[PDB]
Amino acid sequence: NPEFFLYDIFLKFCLKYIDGEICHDLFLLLGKYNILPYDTSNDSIYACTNIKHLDFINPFGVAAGFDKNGVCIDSILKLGFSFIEIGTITPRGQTGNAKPRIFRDVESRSIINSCGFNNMGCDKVTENLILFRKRQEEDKLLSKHIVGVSIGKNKDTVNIVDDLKYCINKIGRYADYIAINVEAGKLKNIILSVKEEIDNLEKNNIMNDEFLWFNTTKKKPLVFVKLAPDLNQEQKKEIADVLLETNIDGMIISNTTTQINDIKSFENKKGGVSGAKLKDISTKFICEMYNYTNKQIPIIASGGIFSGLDALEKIEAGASVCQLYSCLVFNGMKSAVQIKRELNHLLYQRGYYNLKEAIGRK
Numbered sequence: 298n299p300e301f302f303l304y305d306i307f308l309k310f311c312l313k314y315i316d317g318e319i320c321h322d323l324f325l326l327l328g329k330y331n332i333l334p335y336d337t338s339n340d341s342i343y344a345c346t347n348i349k350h351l352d353f354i355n356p357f358g359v360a361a362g363f364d365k366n367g368v369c370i371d372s373i374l375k376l377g378f379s380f381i382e383i384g385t386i387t388p389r390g391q392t393g394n395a396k397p398r399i400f401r402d403v404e405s406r407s408i409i410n411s412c413g414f415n416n417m418g419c420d421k422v423t424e425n426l427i428l429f430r431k432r433q434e435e436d437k438l439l440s441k442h443i444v445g446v447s448i449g450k451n452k453d454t455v456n457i458v459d460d461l462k463y464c465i466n467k468i469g470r471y472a473d474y475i476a477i478n479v480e481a482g483k484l485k486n487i488i489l490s491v492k493e494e495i496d497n498l499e500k501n502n503i504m505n506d507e508f509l510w511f512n513t514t515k516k517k518p519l520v521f522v523k524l525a526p527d528l529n530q531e532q533k534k535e536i537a538d539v540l541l542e543t544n545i546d547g548m549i550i551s552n553t554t555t556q557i558n559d560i561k562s563f564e565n566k567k568g569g570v571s572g573a574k575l576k577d578i579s580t581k582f583i584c585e586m587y588n589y590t591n592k593q594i595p596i597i598a599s600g601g602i603f604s605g606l607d608a609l610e611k612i613e614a615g616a617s618v619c620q621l622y623s624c625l626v627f628n629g630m631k632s633a634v635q636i637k638r639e640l641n642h643l644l645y646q647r648g649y650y651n652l653k654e655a656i657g658r659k
C-alpha cells in the first residue's frame with residue numbers, strides 16, 4: 298500500500314500542475330526503469346475470463362494509446378493488469394499533431410486528445426516488443442499476461458490494406474492479438490486481408506508453432522476491430538453483418554467520441570473525448586452491437602470505466618473484458634488493484650458464481 302500511496306500523491310500533484318503528455322511520458326519512463334509498484338496478488342479464479350481460446354487471468358487491461366511504442370509493457374502489466382494493447386502503430390514513424398495535444402478535466406474525469414497517431418513506427422516498436430517477450434520468459438509476474446497490438450494506416454497512405462499487412466508481417470509473431478484501428482464493404486476487405494496475412498505467417502514458416510509464435514498463447518494472434526461510437530444505427534447494422542461474415546474474433550467498443558460539448562475547459566479544443574463523459578455512450582454501443590451480432594462476437598469494453606460498478610455494467614451489457622485508460626490518469630497506480638476488488642465484491646453481492654455468468658445478462 299505505501300508504495301502505491303506515495304506514488305498516487307505524486308500523481309495527484311502532477312495532475313494539478315503539469316501538462317498531461319509530459320506527465321504521461323514521465324510515468325512511462327519511471328515504469329521503463331522498473332521503480333513502479335507491483336500487484337503480486339493472486340487474482341480470483343471467479344473473475345477470470347476469455348475471448349475464445351485467449352484466456353485472461355483477470356478482466357482488466359490497458360487500452361491502446363497508453364503505451365503506443367511498447368516502452369513500458371512490463372511495469373504497466375505488473376500494476377495488476379491481465380493485458381495491455383500497445384499501439385496504435387503505423388508502418389512508418391509519425392510525429393503526430395502540434396503540441397500540446399492532450400487536455401484533462403479533473404472535475405468531469407474526462408480527457409480530450411488530438412495526438413494524430415504519433416508513434417516510433419512498426420520497426421522500432423517490434424524490437425521493443427521482442428525485448429519484452431525475451432524478458433517475459435524470465436519474469437514470474439509476466440507469465441500468462443497478454444499483449445495485443447493495435448495497428449493502423451499511415452496518415453498519407455496509398456493503400457490501407459498493405460499498411461496493415463506490413464505491420465502484421467513485422468510484429469504479428471509477437472502479438473497475442475491484433476486490433477484493427479481504422480464503409481462496410483471496405484471494412485470487410487480490410488478484415489479478410491488481415492486474417493489472410495496472419496494465416497500466411499503460419500504457412501511461410503518451417504518451424505513448429507512453439508518456435509514460431511514468440512508470444513503468450515503460442516498460437517496465431519486473434520483479430521479484433523475497434524469501433525468509434527459516432528455512427529448511425531444503419532452503419533452499426535452494416536458493420537455488424539460484416540463482422541459476422543468475416544468471422545472476426547472480437548470487437549473493441551469503443552474509441553473516443555466527438556459529440557461531447559458540455560465540458561467548458563474543452564470548448565475550444567479539437568479531438569476525441571474519453572473518460573466519465575463517454576461511459577454511457579460506450580455502454581449503449583455495447584448493447585447495440587451485442588444485439589446486432591446476436592451475441593456471436595466477443596466484446597472488449599472501453600469507455601469511462603473507473604469502478605467495479607462501471608465494469609459490471611459493461612459486462613452485463615455484453616463485454617467479456619474491460620480496458621482502462623482515463624482511470625489510470627485520475628485514480629492512479631492503485632487502479633487495477635482497486636477495481637479488481639470492487640468487481641469481486643459486486644459479483645458476490647449480485648449472487649454471480651463467476652464473471653462469465655454475468656456476461657450479457659442485461
Ligand SMILES: Cc1cc2nc3c(=O)[nH]c(=O)nc-3n(C[C@H](O)[C@H](O)[C@H](O)COP(=O)(O)O)c2cc1C
Pocket residue numbers: 360361362363365384385399408409410412414447478523551552553571572573575599600601602620621622623624
Ligand atoms: C491520449 C490518448 C491516446 C489514445 N490513443 C489511441 C490509439 O492510439 N489507438 C486506439 O485504438 N485508441 C486510442 N485511444 C483511445 C483509448 O484507447 C480508449 O479507447 C479511450 O480513451 C476510452 O477509454 P477511457 O474512457 O477509459 O479513457 C487514446 C486515448 C487517449 C486519451
Ligand SMILES: Cc1cc(Nc2ccc(C(F)(F)F)nc2)n2nc(C(C)(F)F)nc2n1
Pocket residue numbers: 308309311312316317318319320321322324325328333373376399400401408625626629630
Ligand atoms: C498525473 C497524470 C498521469 C498520466 N499518465 C499515467 C498515469 C498512470 C500511469 C501508471 F499507472 F501506469 F503508472 N502511467 C501514466 N497522465 N496521462 C495524461 C494524458 C491524458 F495526457 F495522457 N495525463 C496524465 N496525468
Ligand SMILES: CCCCCCCCCCCC[N+](C)(C)[O-]
Pocket residue numbers: 300303304307331332333334335
Ligand atoms: C513521490 C515519490 C514516491 C516514492 C515511492 C516509493 C518508491 C517505491 C518504488 C519501489 C518499487 C519497487 N519495485 C521493486 C516494485 O520495483
Ligand SMILES: O=C(O)c1cc(=O)[nH]c(=O)[nH]1
Pocket residue numbers: 362385410411412413414415478552553569
Ligand atoms: O492517436 C490518436 O490521436 C488517437 C487514436 C485513437 O484511436 N483514438 C484517439 O482518441 N486518439
